Every structure is written in structure tokens, then in C-alpha cells.
């Protein structure tokens, strides 16, 4: 038998992982049959922390939990209600560990939008109806911080739509101080922001459909305004009025519209604020100190760190995090060097006439993330090993002597593991390696000094079984040389792939700015089924615009968001035809989200290479998508800037060319990210041009189309289309 569509949809063969929460420097928490257990890495033993009977107290309504830093209180999340990608609503209740009972006095209210423990100690802050609250002791009344909150207008301590999605990648917009004296938070005003309005039909019992509306700044429209504040939590009393204090400036960014795009506490009276203009080629990192004699946070021009880019935009999607040292003088930051390569370089708290930073890495590769920073060493991930951009390995570097650069996960299992993700302890004396691919995922615990594997946490032995009678596909990671430079690709080849024979080709495409589809990770997804059962080669290609390969490749599509990554996906297909194992008459392409836009543009190009293709929730033109993301790569839709390419990079302009192909357009009606409008315009243009196509809407489904039945329906519907396109059924 083969890896059938049913096996993917019903999820019979489950790829396991090992989630753990580092509580101490040598202790973590892990789940087992709904019983959270405490593990001490000092020895090889485990102690019972909190039983399944405790979570059972609320039934199956427990969605998540969160233990306090002092290990005396547990935050029990329940009645989970999703909103957008990261935002959600839930009820809460605190569990005491010593007394072993619930705290039923001064409770957390219903529909709490966010909660957080402090960095150190059992302090609680939370957002409710767009207003921030502080709770010093779980049993004591909460002190109200803000009273300006209003639904979809004024947000206190939480992000609106665009900030949640494109900036922080999270709903929370508040940050506790290290010891717990202060509580920083951002405030957003959506008064000028226009509303997207779509219909929600709900269950069939609902007679009249509800009109959902969201403050949504489309490209060129009025954005939200931001305001940063800090409130002293140690001075909160019901006798005196709680008065937060606002950090103004920088003067350079406040010339026009701007964004708050990161914040990190350095010390108890020092904090770094990352800012960014609407034209996202100018970022300022202002470090500010608390003047306790006048109760105002001072932000001098000497402690500012400017970051700019002539070729495109700052960072990959945003200016990276600064990792400060314990004392709070030096901070490390992933920045593009003179050759155009993302590398770690050291800054001090004071700036320099021309802020040159000492790059601790110089090679022709990029640093992915800074995982930890100790007193004498630094942990980071890079794509250096075997010169593969799609690879991930853990590296260790010394601050004093930069030449000491040891790899931690390179040769642990070089065949099975070429893609790692790490979860370090507090001071990084123990760590967990997360082997993702290309073999069966493997998870192991380690000691920092000896690099010695303590044990095997999860090796997918159950997944090793079950797949004993299945025709497993094989992943092939490789590259080609185009125009004096490498371009890596991926291929999920059918089982027992024969080079002499010809197969149907499907181009799996996303190809967004700083995207990477060609990697060494293992996945049991829809592509696995198409190779295992239908004998279809599912390929992927990272052309010009893709990331982790320098800023020459990534910024090639600056102000040109639908041209090079369109043509490079066509060229990639032509190169696969030359290899001699692809049927030229049965070549297709499919993509979700940005991939839908690329798919649609590829089909609209009229190259003659692709027979059919499927666009799922595609962007149609860039004026319809949000401002932050769109204006990062494109300009503003004005004659003064870049309106001409806005008008030329639309899908519906190329509607006449769809007569040469078979097109399947899919889109969820309640999509808050890429609105149903976009496909609605595409389809209307195809109708006017007199070109026949296939369509499918999904009632009340959002961008993910992640409802169980809707997920089963779309991938089953797409399979029928692909069988009919290649003449299989």
C-alpha cells in the first residue's frame, strides 16, 4: 500500500515532537498522558508536579497552562476562543501549589484578551476590554492602569490587526521589567483606519448573516498611531491615582508616520525601543534610562542606533532583536554586512560617529537566530554546514576570541539530521536539540560543557513502525547554476524513482520575500501523498527574492513584487524539463496565500510551460493587501512613488492569457488576512475576458482553512482537479 489521501487527512501516521518548558538552568517541565511532570537534568530522575486530576477539575475545557517563575502559582487557561492568527479570548483561574487549592477571591474576568507573569516573581498583568490591569498578589484586587480602551479603536497592552500580523507576530503588547518594578506597554489608536467589512453566515439557525468589520489599513490608507508608556507597579495604590509616563520621540521617525517594531528591557531602569518609519528603510534603536528624581525616561541622541538600507528594507521582515549582556553595556544584533550578509556584530550602549560594529562572523552564509547569550559564550543557528542555505545547525562562539567557532549539532547524525532547532536553559548549561529532517525527527537532551547526549527524548520509533508497509517518497535537496550564481531547489520524488522514466511535475510555490521552500526538513504532508500514490514529482524553488542567501538575492524584488520570482519559477520548470524525467505535457503549479499570487501570475504569463494550476486564497492586486507588509517591499500607491507597478502587477490585467490553461480558484469567505474581495475581483475579470475556469468558496473559513472538514474538503477537491489535469482518474 501507499501513503494515501486518507492517511494524510485522518492523520494516521503522526510525526511526533517533544515540547518542554525550561523552568530553571537544569530543570524542565514535560507532558505525559495529560500529567505535567517535573524533570531535573542534574540527575536522571523525575518528580510529579501537577496531576491530570487537577486539569480534570475544569473538564476538557483546559486549553493551556502557565506556571509562575517562582513555581508557587499556575495560570489555568480555559474556554479558549480564537480570534485572528495569534489573538484569542479565554477565562482564567489561579492554582496555589503549597495549599493545593484554587484562589476564588478577586478572580480574573471573563474574555481576558491577554495575561502574563512577570520575569521574576508571581506578579500578574492582564488586558480586558482593551484596558490593562495589574495584580500584585493573586488574591488581591487588580489596579486599573488605563481607562481609554474601546473595542476596535483604542488598544491598551494588545496589538490591533496589522501590528499583530505583520509587526510583533503576537497579540501581546506589554512587557514586564526584569525584577518587576515597571510594566511597559504600547497604545494603538485606529480612529482614522478604514474598515474591511465581510459577511459571516454562521450556523444555519442564524436567519440574517452578521457583518463582521475590522480596522484594516490597506496599502496607502490611514495607518494606526502608536504610543509607548511605562507604569510603576511598585507604587500602585487605590489612594493615589495611577499615572503612567510616556516615552516621546525619536524626532527623526516622528517626521511622518511610523511603527513600534520591538522592545526589550536591558536592566531595571534601562530599556531599548526599536522604531521604524512608514517607508521601511530607516530604523532607530533608542535606549532610554529612568531619571527617578523627575520621574521621566530620558532618551539621548548618543544612545540611539540608526539602521538603514539603500537596496531595500531593514532586516528580513523587521529590525532584529538586540541581545544585551547582564551588565547592560554591549548588545549583539544580526545585521547585514558590507557584502550583504546577515551576521552577528557587537554594538556598545554608546553610538559612534559612524556606527561600525565588529562582525564576529564573516563567511558566505547567514546567521538565523541568537538562541542564548552567556557571560563567556554565545549560541546561534546558521546555514553554514556543507554550504547549504536550507540547512540549520547549532553553533557556539566565544566573545573574547572570535576564532573559537565550534559546531554543536553538525556530525551528531549527518545522514538523518541536517535541520536543527534548539531550546536552551536559562544560563545555557543544558540544552535540547530538535532534529527536524531530512530523516525521522529526533529529540535529545544535552550538557553544554561536554556536548554529551544525556538521553533520547523522542526518536519516532512508533512512526518508524506503521510506515513499514508504505511506499515512502524520497526528498532530494540540490541546486542549479543560473546567471553566475547558485539557486537551490527541492523535489519530493516518487518511491523508487527511476531517472529513465518521465513523471508529472507539480511546482509547490510560495516564493515570497525572504521565503524558503527548499530546505532539509521532514514532512508528512499533501506532497508526500502525490508522490507516494499518484507518482507525481512535487518540486519547490527559491529564486530571486528568497532569503537566507544574502541581500543581493533577497532585495532583487524591491519595488518589483511580482516579476522576478514569477519568471524564476518558470525558469526553474524549464530547467527540470532539461533533466529528462519530467513529462512536458503534464506540468502544473500550486500555492497558498502569496503562492496563490505567484501561481496566478505564472499562469497569466502565457509561457506555455504549465498546463494547469491551483491558487488558494491568492492576493490579486497589492492595493487590497495591508499597508505594513505591502509597503515594506512595494512603495506607496501614488504617482510620486510607485503607482505604475501597483497597476501593472495585478492578476486580472493578465486575464486573457488564462485561456491557455486550466485554473482552480479557491478562497474562504471569512478571510481576514487576504480578503475574499481579491479572488472576487480575479474571477470577475476572467468572466469579462470570456475565459472558463473553476472556482470554490468556503463558507465562514479564514485564511488557514483550518477547520477539520474544510481542510479535508479542499485537499480532496484539489486532488480530483490534479488527477483530471494529468489524466489519472
Amino acid at each position, epitope marked *: 500500500r501507499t501513503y494515501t489521501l486518507a492517511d494524510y487527512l485522518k492523520n494516521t501516521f503522526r510525526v511526533k515532537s517533544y515540547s518542554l518548558r525550561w523552568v530553571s538552568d537544569s530543570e524542565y517541565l514535560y507532558k505525559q498522558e495529560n500529567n505535567i511532570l517535573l524533570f531535573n537534568a542534574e540527575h536522571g530522575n523525575s518528580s510529579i508536579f501537577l*496531576e491530570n*486530576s487537577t486539569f480534570e477539575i475544569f473538564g476538557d475545557s483546559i486549553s493551556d497552562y502557565s506556571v509562575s517563575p517562582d513555581r508557587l502559582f499556575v495560570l489555568l487557561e480555559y474556554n479558549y476562543v480564537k480570534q485572528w492568527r495569534h489573538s484569542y479570548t479565554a477565562s482564567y483561574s489561579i492554582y496555589d501549589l503549597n495549599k493545593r487549592q484554587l484562589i476564588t477571591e478577586e478572580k480574573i474576568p471573563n474574555n481576558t484578551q491577554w495575561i502574563t507573569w512577570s520575569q521574576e516573581g508571581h506578579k500578574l498583568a492582564y488586558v480586558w476590554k482593551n484596558d490593562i490591569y495589574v495584580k500584585i498578589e493573586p488574591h488581591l484586587p487588580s489596579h486599573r492602569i488605563t481607562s481609554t480602551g474601546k473595542e476596535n479603536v483604542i488598544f491598551n497592552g494588545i496589538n490591533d490587526w496589522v501590528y499583530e500580523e505583520e509587526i510583533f507576530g503576537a497579540y501581546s503588547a506589554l512587557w514586564w521589567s526584569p525584577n518587576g518594578t515597571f510594566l511597559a506597554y504600547a497604545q494603538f489608536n485606529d480612529t482614522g483606519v478604514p474598515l474591511i467589512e465581510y459577511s459571516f453566515y454562521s*450556523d444555519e439557525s442564524l436567519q440574517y448573516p452578521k457583518t463582521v468589520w475590522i480596522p484594516y489599513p490597506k496599502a496607502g490608507a490611514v495607518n494606526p498611531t502608536v504610543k509607548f508608556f511605562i507604569v510603576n507597579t511598585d507604587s500602585l495604590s487605590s489612594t493615589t491615582t495611577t499615572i503612567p509616563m510616556q516615552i516621546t520621540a525619536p524626532a527623526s521617525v516622528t517626521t511622518g508616520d511610523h511603527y513600534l517594531c520591538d522592545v526589550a528591557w536591558v536592566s531595571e531602569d534601562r530599556i531599548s525601543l526599536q522604531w521604524l518609519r512608514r517607508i521601511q528603510n530607516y530604523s532607530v534603536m533608542a535606549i532610554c534610562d529612568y531619571d527617578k528624581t523627575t520621574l521621566v525616561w530620558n532618551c539621548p541622541t548618543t544612545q540611539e542606533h540608526i539602521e538603514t538600507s539603500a537596496t531595500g528594507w531593514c532586516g528580513r521582515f523587521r529590525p532584529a532583536e538586540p541581545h544585551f549582556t547582564s551588565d547592560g553595556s554591549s548588545f549583539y544584533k544580526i545585521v547585514s554586512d558590507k557584502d550583504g550578509y546577515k551576521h552577528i556584530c557587537q554594538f556598545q550602549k554608546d553610538r559612534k560617529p559612524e556606527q561600525v560594529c565588529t562582525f564576529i562572523t564573516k563567511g558566505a552564509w547567514e546567521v538565523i537566530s541568537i538562541e542564548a547569550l552567556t557571560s563567556d559564550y554565545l549560541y546561534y543557528i546558521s546555514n553554514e554546514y556543507k554550504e547549504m542555505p536550507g540547512g540549520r545547525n547549532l553553533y557556539k562562539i566565544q566573545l573574547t576570541d572570535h576564532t573559537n567557532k565550534k559546531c554543536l549539532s553538525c556530525d551528531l547524525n549527518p545522514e538523518r539530521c541536517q535541520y536543527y532547532s534548539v531550546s536552551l536553559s536559562k544560563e545555557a548549561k543544558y540544552y535540547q536539540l530538535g532534529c527536524r529532517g531530512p530523516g525521522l525527527p529526533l529529540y535529545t537532551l544535552h550538557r553544554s560543557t561536554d556536548q554529551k547526549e544525556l538521553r533520547v527524548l523522542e526518536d519516532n520509533s512508533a512512526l518508524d513502525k506503521m510506515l513499514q508497509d508504505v511506499q515512502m517518497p524520497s526528498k532530494k535537496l540540490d541546486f542549479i547554476v543560473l546567471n553566475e550564481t547558485r539557486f537551490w531547489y527541492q523535489m519530493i520524488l516518487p518511491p523508487h524513482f527511476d531517472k529513465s522514466k518521465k513523471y508529472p511535475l507539480l511546482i509547490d510555490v510560495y516564493a515570497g520575500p525572504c521565503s524558503q521552500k527548499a530546505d532539509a526538513a521532514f514532512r508528512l504532508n499533501w506532497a508526500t501523498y502525490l508522490a507516494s500514490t499518484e507518482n507525481i514529482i512535487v518540486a519547490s524553488f527559491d529564486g530571486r527574492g528568497s532569503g537566507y542567501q544574502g541581500d543581493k538575492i533577497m532585495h532583487a524584488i524591491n519595488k518589483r513584487l511580482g516579476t522576478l520570482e514569477v519568471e524564476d519559477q518558470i525558469e526553474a520548470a524549464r530547467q527540470f524539463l532539461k533533466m529528462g524525467f519530467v513529462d512536458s505535457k503534464r506540468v502544473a503549479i500550486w500555492g497558498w496565500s502569496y503562492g496563490g499570487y505567484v501561481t496566478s501570475m505564472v499562469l497569466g504569463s502565457g509561457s506555455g510551460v504549465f498546463k494547469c494550476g491551483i491558487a488558494v486564497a491568492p492576493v490579486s492586486r497589492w492595493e487590497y493587501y495591508d499597508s505594513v507588509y505591502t509597503e515594506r517591499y512595494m512603495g506607496l500607491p501614488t504617482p510620486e512613488d510607485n503607482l505604475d507597478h501597483y497597476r501593472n502587477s495585478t492578476v486580472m490585467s493578465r486575464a486573457e492569457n488564462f485561456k491557455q490553461v486550466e485554473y482552480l480558484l479557491i478562497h474562504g469567505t471569512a478571510d481576514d488576512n487576504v480578503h475574499f474581495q481579491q479572488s472576487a475581483q480575479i474571477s470577475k475579470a476572467l468572466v469579462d475576458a470570456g475565459v472558463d475556469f473553476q472556482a470554490m468558496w468556503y463558507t465562514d473559513e479564514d485564511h488557514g482553512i483550518a477547520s477539520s472538514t474544510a481542510h479535508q474538503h479542499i485537499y480532496s477537491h484539489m486532488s480530483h482537479f490534479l488527477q483530471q489535469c494529468f489524466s489519472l482518474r
Partner: antibody
Amino acid sequence: EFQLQQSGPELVKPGASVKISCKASGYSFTDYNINWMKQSNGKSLEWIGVVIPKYGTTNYNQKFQGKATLTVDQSSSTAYIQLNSLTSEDSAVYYCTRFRDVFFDVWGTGTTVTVSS
Amino acid sequence: QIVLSQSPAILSASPGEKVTMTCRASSSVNNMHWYQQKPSSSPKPWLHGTSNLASGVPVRFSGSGSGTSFSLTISRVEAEDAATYFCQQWSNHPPTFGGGTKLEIDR
């Protein structure tokens, strides 16, 4: 095999309080949890609260927070519910049930409790 | 919390016939449970996880569903099956009950 048994029927005057037990035997009493219910003579059921015999941790319904109080004796393997300050509205049948971290898989005999002058 | 609505109060069907049973929620439910109660007796556990049988429940009883409309089917109703049924929810705390599904028999 697993048996649950409560005290007999009861009568009390308005303003008074009552207590009714739920003795259990067979399974390891400390492992599984105890939940209590309420049902009027001709109405639907109503959830009151829940206890874990091991630590004696309680969690009540908001509707019965300032009325019912739950306790347990793990040596005798007997759970209790303590109804404070009754009225004519409290006249109903009460049940004690066990939870298998899934649903109410074990049930007691059931006990009618009347409140009248 | 979640107001479950049983459909309808009393329902009759002859011995050996099909009998379907549904519990309509207001918000949403991940996993619906069911309970049988004979008059003047304690409720008994019937179907947990919507489909799976309890320790002692016969094989003719089985259910399914999702969202705000779950179900429970009874293959060939017997004389002993004449008893009131209730649907239970606990995907959201506090847990709630139905109202009345009195399984009548047509003789």
C-alpha cells in the same frame, strides 16, 4: 465492582443546613475525582461542583459558590457535600459521580432532599 | 454558559426501528457526551467521546457529530431501552445539560 453509595433521604426547615455523604469502594479512591449534581423533580440536571480526594482541592459552580461546600475523608474513602442555608428553591435530588478524565462513568444511588416549615 | 437544546421533548418509535438523537449547542463543542436515566433512578453513562461505548454499554448504540450539532443513533430499539436521555457538554466550563429526551416506545 466499583460501588458508590450515599446517605438516606432528608428533611429540614428554612434557614437550616444539611450534610450528605458519598461512600465509595473498589477503585483506588485517591486517584479519581468526585463531582456533584442537582436535579429538580421535573427539570434538567445542574452541575454544582467538584473535588479531588487526594489533596481535597475544590472547584464550585458560580451559581452554588455561596451555598454548597465540599469536603472529603480519604481514610474512610467518603466524600461529603455541605449545603448551607436552604430554602424552598433548594428542594431537589442530589447525585455524586466519578470522573475518568473523560466523563461521569460512575454514579451513586441518588438522594431526595426536601425543605419545608 | 452553553445552552444545550434537546430536540424534541418526547419521541416514540416501535421495537426494531431506527432511532436518531441530536443535541444542539449554542456556541461550540469538541466532544459531546450522553446519559440514560430511568425514572426514579440515577443517570447511567452511555456514550463517551460521542461514539465509544462505556464499560458495560451494549453494541447497538453509537453516535457522531461536530460543531453545534452532535448525534446518537440506536440500532433496533428494545423494550428495555425505554428511558430518558440527556446530553452533556464539557468543552467549556461550567458543564451544562440538555432538557429532556424521553425515549418512548410505540406498542
